[PDB]
Amino acid sequence: KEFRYRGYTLEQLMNMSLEELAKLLPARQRRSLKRGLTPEQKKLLRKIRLAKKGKYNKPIRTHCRDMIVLPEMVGLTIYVHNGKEFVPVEIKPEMIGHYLGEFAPTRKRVQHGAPGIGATRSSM
Amino acid sequence: DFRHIVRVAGVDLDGNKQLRWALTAIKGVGINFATMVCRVAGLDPFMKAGYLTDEQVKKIEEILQDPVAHGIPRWAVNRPKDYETGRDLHLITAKLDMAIREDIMRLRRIRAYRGIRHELGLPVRGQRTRSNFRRGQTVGV
RNA sequence: AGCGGGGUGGAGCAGCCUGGUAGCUCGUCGGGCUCAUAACCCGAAGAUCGUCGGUUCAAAUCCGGCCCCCGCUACCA
RNA sequence: AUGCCCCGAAACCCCCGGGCUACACGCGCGCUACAAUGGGCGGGACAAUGGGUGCCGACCCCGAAAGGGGGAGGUAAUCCCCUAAACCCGCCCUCAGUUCGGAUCGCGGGCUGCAACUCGCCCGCGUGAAGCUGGAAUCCCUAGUACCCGCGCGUCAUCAUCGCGC
Ligand code: MET
Ligand SMILES: [Mg+2]
Ligand SMILES: [Mg+2]
Ligand SMILES: [Mg+2]
Ligand SMILES: [Mg+2]
Ligand SMILES: [Mg+2]
């Protein structure tokens, strides 16, 4: 019942170089990592590593909806902007390889009301 | 010799069809993969399925168990780079169905966007929904 | 309590005597035609048949007891 | 371009993230089909208009494909895009929701870009929805015209079921 990503445990994924990890992700993530990180993602990664070291005991909030979830981010809680607010996301091991924005929906679910005037030919 | 019904891997096959088309009744085997397995097994793809012998059926099922080990390219299987073991696998029947169900369940557990779309029964791959994809009854004004 | 009658889409009848769709008018929803509304034309939803059995290859109704309803009469505590 | 009225430390000027892409439903214009006046596999034929230096790229090598690494010539009647499809020949299927149809979904591989989840395009294997010719109504067209078949340019870093042309 333990977690394995390609036959590797979480600890094995922890002790992997960034280039080595990219060979296990899908094509899109591998290309994105091969081209390097944007400066904003660099700042976010610095904050995450600082929090892991035992410092920065504050909520982590970000605008970087296109950041790829990495194995070293497992166990934290991140607040991703959805357009008007930061929603909390609890990172689980099975989230490796996905963008952050996948967990912060931007639109509200639709519940339809009664059709109005002009909705049909006879109602105009 | 001729048998009007032949059972392969738990599926009954027509005996009057060509082998390449007879094998497509198995869920998880298309026309191309069937031709590949027929050529690997050293059988004429155009032979009637009703002339098979027991050893040939055994060979075909063995090939279907582990196709990669028998010379089929790694890019022709229907589940390469498995999520758990990391190997290249080919699945048929029930195992295929439960693998797909497990993938969708994994998507749903983490509350990903595609998981919500699967739950609500809405298009997943970015289609527009204002005009088409209508399945219901007209509402009156 | 006795006698007679029938229960058929949301409404009103065919449908049983002569067995082969559950059919006919109104109604609800949608579309046509017109610059537009009314009139007019078209399509769809809606009664698995109100329970069992006998008949029949085939009916509900042909018949039978049950479900309740309707009408007339009897009925002096 | 411009009169009047308004805002004039915001209704002006920048940056980040969202939306214009939502979805019980009504409608317009189209594409793909409902198969033999066909589907698949191998082989054989014949164009025109246009465009190219922030670009078109022959030719060689690697890869199953999408693609990748070098790179002649071209500021162009000189080099390149550029050996079209419908059509013809041979074999399989024989009236069936099928060897018809290819919507929907799973896994994997790529390109453009500062960025691909919301929300891009391409490739391999798998899966296999409605649809068996369409009521009342209603549209276009008189000759190289209508029908059928592909191609070029515009938009354009990437993206054509569109517009204008051949
Ligand atoms: C009237 O006669 C009366 N007493 C009859 C019986 S009452 C239950
Ligand atoms: Mg009217
Ligand atoms: Mg729009
Ligand atoms: Mg086909
Ligand atoms: Mg996307
Ligand atoms: Mg047919």
Short mmCIF file of C-alpha atoms (C1' of nucleotides) and ligand atoms in Angstrom, two decimals:
data_model
loop_
_atom_site.label_atom_id
_atom_site.label_comp_id
_atom_site.label_asym_id
_atom_site.label_seq_id
_atom_site.Cartn_x
_atom_site.Cartn_y
_atom_site.Cartn_z
CA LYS A 1 0.00 0.00 0.00
CA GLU A 2 3.10 2.18 -0.03
CA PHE A 3 3.58 4.87 -2.67
CA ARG A 4 5.71 4.22 -5.75
CA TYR A 5 5.98 6.42 -8.83
CA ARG A 6 7.93 4.27 -11.32
CA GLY A 7 9.00 1.55 -8.94
CA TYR A 8 10.72 4.04 -6.63
CA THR A 9 9.83 4.96 -3.07
CA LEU A 10 9.38 8.55 -1.91
CA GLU A 11 12.77 8.52 -0.18
CA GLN A 12 14.43 7.37 -3.40
CA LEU A 13 12.76 10.24 -5.26
CA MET A 14 14.05 12.65 -2.60
CA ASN A 15 17.69 11.74 -3.31
CA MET A 16 17.57 12.40 -7.05
CA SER A 17 19.12 15.14 -9.13
CA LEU A 18 16.76 17.38 -11.08
CA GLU A 19 17.99 15.95 -14.39
CA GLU A 20 17.54 12.38 -13.13
CA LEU A 21 13.98 13.08 -11.98
CA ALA A 22 12.96 14.53 -15.35
CA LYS A 23 13.45 11.16 -17.05
CA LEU A 24 10.47 9.79 -15.10
CA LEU A 25 7.98 12.62 -15.69
CA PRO A 26 5.85 12.83 -18.85
CA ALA A 27 7.04 14.67 -21.96
CA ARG A 28 5.52 18.06 -21.10
CA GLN A 29 7.07 18.24 -17.63
CA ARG A 30 10.41 17.00 -18.96
CA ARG A 31 10.48 19.75 -21.59
CA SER A 32 9.45 22.39 -19.05
CA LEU A 33 12.21 21.37 -16.65
CA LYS A 34 14.77 21.10 -19.46
CA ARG A 35 14.20 24.76 -20.37
CA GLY A 36 14.79 25.94 -16.79
CA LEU A 37 12.68 27.74 -14.22
CA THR A 38 11.35 31.27 -14.43
CA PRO A 39 12.60 33.76 -11.81
CA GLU A 40 9.28 33.68 -9.95
CA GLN A 41 9.52 29.90 -9.68
CA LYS A 42 13.08 30.35 -8.43
CA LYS A 43 11.87 32.59 -5.61
CA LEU A 44 9.05 30.16 -4.77
CA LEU A 45 11.47 27.22 -4.68
CA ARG A 46 13.82 29.18 -2.42
CA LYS A 47 10.94 29.85 -0.03
CA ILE A 48 9.92 26.18 -0.07
CA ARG A 49 13.45 24.97 0.68
CA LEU A 50 13.78 27.56 3.44
CA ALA A 51 10.54 26.29 4.98
CA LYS A 52 11.82 22.71 4.75
CA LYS A 53 15.03 23.70 6.55
CA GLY A 54 12.95 24.68 9.60
CA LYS A 55 12.65 28.43 8.98
CA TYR A 56 9.91 30.63 7.53
CA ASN A 57 7.02 29.54 9.78
CA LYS A 58 4.44 31.48 7.77
CA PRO A 59 1.78 30.63 5.17
CA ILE A 60 3.16 30.24 1.65
CA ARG A 61 1.05 32.12 -0.91
CA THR A 62 1.83 32.37 -4.61
CA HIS A 63 0.64 33.54 -8.01
CA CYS A 64 2.67 30.86 -9.85
CA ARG A 65 -0.17 28.70 -11.12
CA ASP A 66 2.20 27.01 -13.61
CA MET A 67 4.68 25.59 -11.09
CA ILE A 68 5.28 21.85 -11.36
CA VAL A 69 4.86 19.87 -8.14
CA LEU A 70 8.14 18.30 -7.03
CA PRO A 71 8.79 15.44 -4.58
CA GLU A 72 10.52 17.75 -2.09
CA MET A 73 7.30 19.80 -1.79
CA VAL A 74 5.31 16.93 -0.26
CA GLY A 75 3.89 17.66 3.18
CA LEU A 76 3.43 21.43 2.92
CA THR A 77 0.36 23.60 2.35
CA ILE A 78 0.38 26.22 -0.41
CA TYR A 79 -2.15 28.96 -1.19
CA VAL A 80 -2.63 29.32 -4.95
CA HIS A 81 -4.31 32.42 -6.37
CA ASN A 82 -7.45 31.60 -8.36
CA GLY A 83 -8.22 35.08 -9.67
CA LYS A 84 -9.65 36.65 -6.52
CA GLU A 85 -8.43 34.60 -3.53
CA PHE A 86 -5.79 32.16 -2.32
CA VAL A 87 -7.14 28.65 -1.73
CA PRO A 88 -5.26 26.12 0.44
CA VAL A 89 -3.80 23.01 -1.19
CA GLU A 90 -2.41 20.11 0.85
CA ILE A 91 0.29 18.41 -1.22
CA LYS A 92 -0.07 14.62 -1.37
CA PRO A 93 2.49 12.21 -2.85
CA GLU A 94 0.21 11.40 -5.80
CA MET A 95 0.38 15.05 -6.92
CA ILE A 96 3.90 14.69 -8.33
CA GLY A 97 4.11 15.98 -11.89
CA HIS A 98 1.03 18.22 -11.95
CA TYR A 99 0.72 21.98 -12.17
CA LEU A 100 -0.44 23.86 -9.09
CA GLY A 101 -3.28 25.56 -10.98
CA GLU A 102 -4.95 22.18 -11.48
CA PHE A 103 -6.03 22.29 -7.82
CA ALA A 104 -7.41 25.87 -7.69
CA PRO A 105 -10.54 26.12 -9.86
CA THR A 106 -11.24 29.54 -11.37
CA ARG A 107 -14.94 29.19 -12.26
CA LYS A 108 -17.93 28.48 -10.05
CA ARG A 109 -20.17 25.50 -10.75
CA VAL A 110 -23.32 26.34 -12.71
CA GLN A 111 -26.86 25.87 -11.40
CA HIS A 112 -29.38 26.93 -14.03
CA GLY A 113 -32.48 28.97 -13.31
CA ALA A 114 -35.66 29.49 -15.26
CA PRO A 115 -35.15 30.49 -18.92
CA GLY A 116 -35.89 34.16 -19.48
CA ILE A 117 -37.74 36.15 -22.11
CA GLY A 118 -36.23 35.58 -25.54
CA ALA A 119 -34.90 32.09 -24.76
CA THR A 120 -37.27 30.55 -27.33
CA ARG A 121 -38.83 31.68 -30.59
CA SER A 122 -42.28 32.12 -29.03
CA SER A 123 -41.02 34.01 -25.96
CA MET A 124 -39.66 37.04 -27.84
CA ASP B 1 -10.02 -30.12 -38.22
CA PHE B 2 -12.33 -27.15 -38.68
CA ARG B 3 -14.06 -25.80 -35.58
CA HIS B 4 -16.80 -23.19 -35.84
CA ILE B 5 -15.95 -21.81 -32.37
CA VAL B 6 -12.46 -21.39 -30.90
CA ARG B 7 -11.84 -19.94 -27.44
CA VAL B 8 -8.71 -17.82 -26.92
CA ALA B 9 -7.87 -16.07 -23.63
CA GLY B 10 -11.42 -16.46 -22.34
CA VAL B 11 -13.08 -15.12 -25.50
CA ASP B 12 -14.97 -17.17 -28.08
CA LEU B 13 -13.76 -16.49 -31.62
CA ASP B 14 -15.57 -17.00 -34.91
CA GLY B 15 -14.08 -19.78 -37.00
CA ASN B 16 -15.18 -18.44 -40.38
CA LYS B 17 -13.30 -15.14 -40.07
CA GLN B 18 -9.69 -14.50 -40.94
CA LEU B 19 -7.42 -14.80 -37.92
CA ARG B 20 -6.35 -11.15 -37.96
CA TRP B 21 -9.97 -10.00 -37.83
CA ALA B 22 -11.11 -12.81 -35.54
CA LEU B 23 -8.62 -11.73 -32.87
CA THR B 24 -10.15 -8.24 -32.68
CA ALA B 25 -13.09 -9.55 -30.63
CA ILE B 26 -10.80 -9.38 -27.59
CA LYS B 27 -11.10 -6.03 -25.82
CA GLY B 28 -7.64 -4.50 -25.99
CA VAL B 29 -6.57 -5.89 -29.39
CA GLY B 30 -7.05 -3.88 -32.57
CA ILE B 31 -6.34 -4.80 -36.16
CA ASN B 32 -2.73 -3.58 -36.10
CA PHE B 33 -1.75 -5.32 -32.86
CA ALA B 34 -3.44 -8.51 -34.06
CA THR B 35 -1.39 -8.42 -37.27
CA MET B 36 1.77 -7.90 -35.22
CA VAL B 37 1.07 -10.88 -32.97
CA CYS B 38 0.15 -13.05 -35.97
CA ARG B 39 3.45 -12.21 -37.67
CA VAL B 40 5.45 -12.79 -34.48
CA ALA B 41 3.77 -16.17 -33.95
CA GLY B 42 4.72 -17.20 -37.48
CA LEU B 43 1.14 -17.68 -38.70
CA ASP B 44 -0.47 -16.49 -41.91
CA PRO B 45 -2.78 -13.60 -40.94
CA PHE B 46 -5.21 -14.60 -43.70
CA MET B 47 -5.82 -18.17 -42.49
CA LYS B 48 -9.25 -19.12 -41.21
CA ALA B 49 -9.44 -19.03 -37.43
CA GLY B 50 -11.09 -22.46 -37.42
CA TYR B 51 -7.93 -24.32 -38.45
CA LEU B 52 -5.98 -23.46 -35.30
CA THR B 53 -4.50 -26.23 -33.17
CA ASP B 54 -4.07 -26.31 -29.40
CA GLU B 55 -0.33 -25.58 -29.48
CA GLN B 56 -0.89 -22.54 -31.69
CA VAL B 57 -3.54 -21.18 -29.30
CA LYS B 58 -1.15 -21.74 -26.40
CA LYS B 59 1.59 -19.88 -28.27
CA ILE B 60 -0.74 -16.97 -29.04
CA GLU B 61 -1.84 -16.68 -25.42
CA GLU B 62 1.78 -16.83 -24.25
CA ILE B 63 2.66 -14.01 -26.65
CA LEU B 64 -0.31 -12.00 -25.37
CA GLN B 65 0.98 -12.42 -21.81
CA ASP B 66 4.32 -10.66 -22.40
CA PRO B 67 4.50 -9.26 -25.94
CA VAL B 68 7.69 -7.23 -25.40
CA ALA B 69 9.65 -10.35 -24.46
CA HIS B 70 8.66 -11.90 -27.82
CA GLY B 71 9.91 -9.11 -30.09
CA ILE B 72 7.07 -6.57 -30.25
CA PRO B 73 8.37 -2.97 -30.12
CA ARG B 74 7.93 -1.06 -26.87
CA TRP B 75 5.98 1.72 -28.62
CA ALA B 76 3.17 -0.60 -29.78
CA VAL B 77 1.77 -1.62 -26.37
CA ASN B 78 -1.32 0.04 -24.91
CA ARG B 79 0.22 0.89 -21.51
CA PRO B 80 3.89 1.85 -21.74
CA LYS B 81 5.82 3.07 -18.69
CA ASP B 82 3.41 1.77 -16.06
CA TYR B 83 2.59 4.12 -13.20
CA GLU B 84 3.44 1.61 -10.47
CA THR B 85 6.15 -0.76 -11.69
CA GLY B 86 7.55 1.46 -14.44
CA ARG B 87 7.54 -1.31 -17.05
CA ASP B 88 5.83 -1.50 -20.44
CA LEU B 89 2.65 -3.58 -20.24
CA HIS B 90 -0.26 -4.68 -22.41
CA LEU B 91 -3.64 -5.30 -20.79
CA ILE B 92 -6.85 -6.94 -21.99
CA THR B 93 -10.38 -7.60 -20.68
CA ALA B 94 -11.00 -7.01 -16.96
CA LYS B 95 -7.46 -5.96 -16.03
CA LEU B 96 -7.62 -3.17 -18.61
CA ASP B 97 -10.98 -1.99 -17.27
CA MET B 98 -9.81 -1.93 -13.66
CA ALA B 99 -6.58 -0.16 -14.64
CA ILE B 100 -8.56 2.61 -16.34
CA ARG B 101 -10.91 2.81 -13.36
CA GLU B 102 -7.91 3.08 -11.03
CA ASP B 103 -6.45 5.91 -13.11
CA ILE B 104 -9.70 7.87 -12.93
CA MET B 105 -10.00 7.19 -9.20
CA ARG B 106 -6.46 8.44 -8.62
CA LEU B 107 -7.35 11.63 -10.48
CA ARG B 108 -10.47 12.02 -8.34
CA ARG B 109 -8.70 11.46 -5.01
CA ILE B 110 -6.36 14.45 -5.36
CA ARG B 111 -9.25 16.70 -6.50
CA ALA B 112 -7.63 17.54 -9.82
CA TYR B 113 -9.50 19.40 -12.56
CA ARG B 114 -9.89 16.33 -14.77
CA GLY B 115 -11.18 14.39 -11.77
CA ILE B 116 -13.96 16.92 -11.18
CA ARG B 117 -14.80 16.87 -14.89
CA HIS B 118 -15.03 13.07 -14.77
CA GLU B 119 -17.28 13.25 -11.71
CA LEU B 120 -19.70 15.76 -13.22
CA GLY B 121 -19.91 13.98 -16.58
CA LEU B 122 -18.62 16.99 -18.54
CA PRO B 123 -16.09 17.18 -21.40
CA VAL B 124 -12.51 16.80 -20.22
CA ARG B 125 -10.24 17.82 -23.13
CA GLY B 126 -11.19 21.48 -23.42
CA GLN B 127 -14.20 21.47 -25.74
CA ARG B 128 -16.75 24.27 -25.88
CA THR B 129 -20.05 23.46 -24.17
CA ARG B 130 -22.40 26.31 -25.14
CA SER B 131 -23.67 24.84 -28.43
CA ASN B 132 -22.97 21.10 -28.70
CA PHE B 133 -22.76 18.25 -26.16
CA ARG B 134 -26.47 18.69 -25.45
CA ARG B 135 -28.20 15.65 -23.96
CA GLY B 136 -31.49 16.37 -22.22
CA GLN B 137 -34.98 17.76 -22.75
CA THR B 138 -36.15 21.20 -23.80
CA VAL B 139 -37.08 23.60 -21.01
CA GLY B 140 -40.10 25.85 -21.52
CA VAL B 141 -40.29 29.58 -20.83
"C1'" A C 1 -78.91 -4.16 3.60
"C1'" G C 2 -81.05 -5.52 -1.60
"C1'" C C 3 -80.84 -4.34 -7.12
"C1'" G C 4 -78.39 -2.12 -11.35
"C1'" G C 5 -73.67 0.46 -13.89
"C1'" G C 6 -68.82 1.56 -14.94
"C1'" G C 7 -63.83 2.31 -13.70
"C1'" U C 8 -59.45 3.72 -20.39
"C1'" G C 9 -52.89 9.73 -20.68
"C1'" G C 10 -54.28 16.19 -17.54
"C1'" A C 11 -60.00 16.28 -19.45
"C1'" G C 12 -64.13 13.79 -22.57
"C1'" C C 13 -65.00 9.16 -25.85
"C1'" A C 14 -63.57 4.96 -28.86
"C1'" G C 15 -61.25 0.00 -27.42
"C1'" C C 16 -65.77 -5.62 -25.67
"C1'" C C 17 -71.45 -8.08 -29.61
"C1'" U C 18 -67.44 -9.24 -35.17
"C1'" G C 19 -60.37 -9.99 -30.60
"C1'" G C 20 -54.29 -8.12 -34.55
"C1'" U C 21 -52.62 0.07 -32.84
"C1'" A C 22 -53.94 0.66 -26.41
"C1'" G C 23 -56.77 4.61 -31.17
"C1'" C C 24 -60.07 9.70 -31.49
"C1'" U C 25 -61.36 15.80 -29.85
"C1'" C C 26 -59.51 19.28 -26.10
"C1'" G C 27 -55.05 20.35 -23.12
"C1'" U C 28 -49.13 21.08 -22.04
"C1'" C C 29 -44.39 21.70 -24.43
"C1'" G C 30 -41.30 22.59 -29.18
"C1'" G C 31 -40.84 24.01 -34.37
"C1'" G C 32 -42.86 26.14 -39.01
"C1'" C C 33 -45.49 30.36 -41.85
"C1'" U C 34 -45.80 36.54 -41.08
"C1'" C C 35 -42.50 42.81 -40.44
"C1'" A C 36 -45.00 41.04 -35.94
"C1'" U C 37 -49.62 38.96 -33.05
"C1'" A C 38 -54.14 36.03 -33.83
"C1'" A C 39 -55.89 32.25 -37.17
"C1'" C C 40 -53.45 27.89 -39.95
"C1'" C C 41 -49.60 23.49 -40.68
"C1'" C C 42 -46.10 19.71 -38.31
"C1'" G C 43 -43.73 16.87 -34.50
"C1'" A C 44 -43.13 15.05 -29.30
"C1'" A C 45 -44.12 13.79 -24.12
"C1'" G C 46 -47.97 11.73 -21.53
"C1'" A C 47 -52.76 5.44 -19.96
"C1'" U C 48 -47.77 -1.62 -19.75
"C1'" C C 49 -53.17 -1.28 -20.21
"C1'" G C 50 -56.83 -0.99 -12.56
"C1'" U C 51 -54.86 -6.50 -9.82
"C1'" C C 52 -55.27 -12.99 -10.80
"C1'" G C 53 -57.46 -16.74 -13.79
"C1'" G C 54 -60.45 -19.11 -17.73
"C1'" U C 55 -60.55 -18.20 -23.91
"C1'" U C 56 -57.41 -17.66 -27.91
"C1'" C C 57 -51.60 -17.98 -31.84
"C1'" A C 58 -53.61 -13.97 -30.58
"C1'" A C 59 -58.17 -9.70 -25.92
"C1'" A C 60 -58.53 -5.43 -21.23
"C1'" U C 61 -63.80 -6.12 -23.64
"C1'" C C 62 -65.79 -12.51 -24.05
"C1'" C C 63 -66.29 -14.39 -18.94
"C1'" G C 64 -65.30 -15.12 -13.59
"C1'" G C 65 -64.03 -13.35 -7.41
"C1'" C C 66 -61.55 -9.68 -5.64
"C1'" C C 67 -60.13 -2.76 -5.24
"C1'" C C 68 -63.26 1.14 -4.58
"C1'" C C 69 -66.74 4.39 -6.82
"C1'" C C 70 -71.91 5.96 -8.96
"C1'" G C 71 -77.43 5.57 -9.17
"C1'" C C 72 -82.35 3.56 -7.21
"C1'" U C 73 -84.89 1.09 -3.30
"C1'" A C 74 -85.57 -1.08 1.54
"C1'" C C 75 -84.31 0.45 6.35
"C1'" C C 76 -88.89 3.83 13.23
"C1'" A C 77 -83.31 3.21 17.48
"C1'" A D 1 -10.62 63.95 -37.42
"C1'" U D 2 -14.31 66.69 -34.22
"C1'" G D 3 -18.58 70.21 -30.81
"C1'" C D 4 -20.97 69.70 -25.95
"C1'" C D 5 -21.21 67.04 -21.20
"C1'" C D 6 -18.49 64.18 -17.69
"C1'" C D 7 -13.49 61.91 -14.80
"C1'" G D 8 -9.15 64.66 -13.76
"C1'" A D 9 -5.14 61.89 -8.24
"C1'" A D 10 -9.23 58.63 -11.00
"C1'" A D 11 -13.20 56.90 -15.71
"C1'" C D 12 -5.56 58.89 -17.07
"C1'" C D 13 -0.51 55.62 -17.38
"C1'" C D 14 2.02 50.69 -16.02
"C1'" C D 15 2.66 45.48 -13.66
"C1'" C D 16 0.66 40.29 -11.62
"C1'" G D 17 -3.28 36.71 -11.58
"C1'" G D 18 -8.35 35.69 -13.70
"C1'" G D 19 -12.41 36.31 -17.75
"C1'" C D 20 -14.11 36.99 -22.92
"C1'" U D 21 -13.40 29.36 -23.75
"C1'" A D 22 -19.21 28.77 -18.14
"C1'" C D 23 -23.93 25.19 -19.81
"C1'" A D 24 -30.95 22.03 -17.95
"C1'" C D 25 -31.96 24.79 -23.03
"C1'" G D 26 -33.93 27.74 -28.48
"C1'" C D 27 -31.75 29.35 -33.36
"C1'" G D 28 -28.16 30.65 -38.06
"C1'" C D 29 -24.07 28.98 -41.40
"C1'" G D 30 -21.08 24.68 -42.09
"C1'" C D 31 -17.85 19.84 -41.66
"C1'" U D 32 -18.14 14.35 -41.14
"C1'" A D 33 -21.45 10.40 -42.06
"C1'" C D 34 -25.50 7.04 -42.31
"C1'" A D 35 -21.76 2.65 -47.01
"C1'" A D 36 -20.84 -1.09 -53.10
"C1'" U D 37 -22.44 5.33 -57.60
"C1'" G D 38 -18.03 1.62 -51.37
"C1'" G D 39 -13.86 0.60 -47.01
"C1'" G D 40 -8.70 -1.33 -46.86
"C1'" C D 41 -3.69 -2.72 -48.84
"C1'" G D 42 0.21 -2.56 -53.01
"C1'" G D 43 1.25 -0.21 -57.66
"C1'" G D 44 0.56 3.73 -62.08
"C1'" A D 45 -0.81 9.10 -64.19
"C1'" C D 46 -1.63 14.77 -65.19
"C1'" A D 47 -1.89 21.39 -62.75
"C1'" A D 48 -2.46 26.57 -61.94
"C1'" U D 49 -2.55 30.94 -59.01
"C1'" G D 50 0.82 32.93 -55.39
"C1'" G D 51 5.07 33.51 -51.73
"C1'" G D 52 10.47 33.66 -49.70
"C1'" U D 53 16.36 37.42 -45.89
"C1'" G D 54 13.03 38.29 -38.41
"C1'" C D 55 12.79 34.19 -44.44
"C1'" C D 56 12.18 29.66 -48.38
"C1'" G D 57 15.50 25.86 -47.59
"C1'" A D 58 17.47 21.43 -51.91
"C1'" C D 59 21.28 17.44 -50.50
"C1'" C D 60 23.59 13.98 -46.61
"C1'" C D 61 23.06 11.43 -41.59
"C1'" C D 62 19.91 9.58 -37.05
"C1'" G D 63 14.70 7.93 -35.72
"C1'" A D 64 8.68 3.53 -36.26
"C1'" A D 65 6.09 8.32 -36.55
"C1'" A D 66 5.66 13.28 -35.09
"C1'" G D 67 10.51 15.11 -35.26
"C1'" G D 68 16.30 15.92 -34.55
"C1'" G D 69 21.90 17.34 -36.13
"C1'" G D 70 24.70 19.68 -40.34
"C1'" G D 71 23.86 22.48 -44.65
"C1'" A D 72 24.53 24.09 -51.25
"C1'" G D 73 21.79 27.85 -53.72
"C1'" G D 74 18.45 32.18 -53.48
"C1'" U D 75 17.41 39.99 -52.49
"C1'" A D 76 14.84 35.41 -57.23
"C1'" A D 77 11.91 33.81 -65.60
"C1'" U D 78 18.29 31.46 -62.41
"C1'" C D 79 17.55 28.66 -56.09
"C1'" C D 80 13.26 26.89 -52.91
"C1'" C D 81 8.02 26.08 -51.24
"C1'" C D 82 6.52 21.77 -55.51
"C1'" U D 83 6.55 14.47 -58.16
"C1'" A D 84 -1.80 17.44 -55.71
"C1'" A D 85 -6.49 14.90 -55.03
"C1'" A D 86 -10.68 13.12 -57.36
"C1'" C D 87 -8.87 9.15 -61.64
"C1'" C D 88 -6.68 3.99 -63.47
"C1'" C D 89 -4.66 -1.51 -62.47
"C1'" G D 90 -4.39 -6.04 -59.09
"C1'" C D 91 -5.96 -8.57 -54.30
"C1'" C D 92 -9.31 -8.89 -49.41
"C1'" C D 93 -14.30 -7.69 -47.50
"C1'" U D 94 -20.36 -9.13 -49.84
"C1'" C D 95 -25.49 -5.87 -47.58
"C1'" A D 96 -23.90 -6.40 -42.02
"C1'" G D 97 -24.39 -1.15 -36.85
"C1'" U D 98 -20.28 -4.66 -40.47
"C1'" U D 99 -13.17 -4.59 -42.38
"C1'" C D 100 -19.51 1.26 -42.50
"C1'" G D 101 -19.01 5.84 -38.85
"C1'" G D 102 -14.92 7.87 -35.59
"C1'" A D 103 -17.54 11.14 -31.39
"C1'" U D 104 -15.64 10.17 -26.27
"C1'" C D 105 -11.85 8.55 -23.02
"C1'" G D 106 -6.59 5.96 -20.93
"C1'" C D 107 -1.27 5.54 -21.29
"C1'" G D 108 3.18 7.20 -23.77
"C1'" G D 109 6.40 10.48 -27.36
"C1'" G D 110 7.17 15.64 -29.56
"C1'" C D 111 7.22 21.26 -31.50
"C1'" U D 112 6.38 26.94 -30.75
"C1'" G D 113 6.84 30.15 -26.82
"C1'" C D 114 9.22 34.15 -21.12
"C1'" A D 115 4.71 30.87 -19.78
"C1'" A D 116 0.71 25.23 -22.48
"C1'" C D 117 -3.71 23.71 -15.60
"C1'" U D 118 -7.75 26.99 -16.65
"C1'" C D 119 -6.74 27.34 -22.45
"C1'" G D 120 -2.60 25.49 -27.94
"C1'" C D 121 -1.15 22.06 -32.17
"C1'" C D 122 1.11 17.08 -33.90
"C1'" C D 123 2.29 11.43 -33.51
"C1'" G D 124 1.88 5.63 -31.61
"C1'" C D 125 -1.13 1.77 -29.25
"C1'" G D 126 -5.80 0.95 -27.06
"C1'" U D 127 -11.49 2.18 -26.54
"C1'" G D 128 -15.58 2.34 -30.04
"C1'" A D 129 -21.34 6.99 -29.03
"C1'" A D 130 -25.53 8.72 -32.08
"C1'" G D 131 -26.39 7.65 -37.04
"C1'" C D 132 -29.58 2.55 -41.76
"C1'" U D 133 -31.85 8.73 -46.54
"C1'" G D 134 -34.48 12.86 -42.89
"C1'" G D 135 -42.35 15.99 -41.20
"C1'" A D 136 -44.41 20.82 -42.01
"C1'" A D 137 -41.20 23.96 -44.50
"C1'" U D 138 -37.14 26.22 -47.31
"C1'" C D 139 -32.00 27.77 -50.30
"C1'" C D 140 -28.28 28.21 -54.90
"C1'" C D 141 -27.69 27.89 -59.96
"C1'" U D 142 -28.52 29.02 -67.52
"C1'" A D 143 -22.03 26.81 -69.75
"C1'" G D 144 -16.33 25.72 -69.02
"C1'" U D 145 -21.88 27.57 -65.40
"C1'" A D 146 -23.86 24.02 -61.23
"C1'" C D 147 -22.11 19.38 -58.76
"C1'" C D 148 -17.58 16.57 -57.18
"C1'" C D 149 -11.72 17.20 -56.06
"C1'" G D 150 -7.62 19.14 -54.04
"C1'" C D 151 -3.93 23.62 -53.83
"C1'" G D 152 -2.17 29.04 -52.88
"C1'" C D 153 -2.26 33.71 -50.07
"C1'" G D 154 -4.43 36.69 -45.58
"C1'" U D 155 -4.55 36.25 -40.42
"C1'" C D 156 0.40 33.95 -38.17
"C1'" A D 157 6.18 32.79 -32.65
"C1'" U D 158 2.58 28.20 -32.67
"C1'" C D 159 -2.86 27.33 -34.32
"C1'" A D 160 -7.84 27.01 -40.51
"C1'" U D 161 -14.03 22.94 -40.73
"C1'" C D 162 -13.01 30.76 -42.17
"C1'" G D 163 -12.25 34.98 -46.05
"C1'" C D 164 -10.17 36.07 -50.86
"C1'" G D 165 -8.22 33.41 -55.21
"C1'" C D 166 -6.46 28.98 -58.34
C1 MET E 1 -83.19 0.48 20.76
O1 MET E 1 -84.17 -0.27 20.75
C2 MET E 1 -81.88 0.00 21.34
N1 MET E 1 -82.05 -0.23 22.78
C3 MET E 1 -81.36 -1.23 20.67
C4 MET E 1 -79.96 -1.63 20.94
S1 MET E 1 -78.73 -0.31 21.04
C5 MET E 1 -77.11 -1.01 20.98
MG MG E 2 -47.99 32.83 -33.89
MG MG E 3 -16.10 34.89 -28.38
MG MG E 4 -13.70 2.27 -41.12
MG MG E 5 -4.46 22.09 -21.76
MG MG E 6 -27.25 0.25 -43.72
#
